[PDB]
């Protein structure tokens, strides 16, 4: 049952990019990461999604890696209409 906790920790350069990959998403899609973070991090469920403030430095590895593989799934698909 350790696979979920065995996911490697998101490094600084990854975290920074993650907060960026996440912010690349359309508003609706950041509704997912807030949902992930808020659920995985019971410490920030007071933050309302419309006024969310996520702390990438408080998130546990699994959350950060969930956030990533998620946005990565959105961004690698159809989400680059600018560049």
């Amino acid at each position: 049952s350790e696979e979920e906790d065995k996911c490697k920790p998101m490094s600084y350069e990854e975290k920074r990019q993650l907060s960026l990959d996440i912010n690349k998403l359309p508003g609706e899609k950041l509704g997912r990461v807030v949902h992930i973070i808020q659920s995985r991090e019971p410490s920030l469920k007071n933050s309302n999604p419309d006024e969310i403030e996520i702390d990438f430095e408080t998130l546990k590895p699994s959350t950060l890696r969930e956030l990533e593989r998620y946005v990565t799934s959105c961004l690698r698909k159809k989400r680059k209409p600018q560049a």
Partner: peptide, 13 residues
């Protein structure tokens, strides 16, 4: 880092 400034203002906007 990724507080209300970056997140919220890229989120709500």
């Amino acid at each position: 880092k990724w507080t209300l400034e970056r997140l919220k203002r890229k989120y709500r906007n």
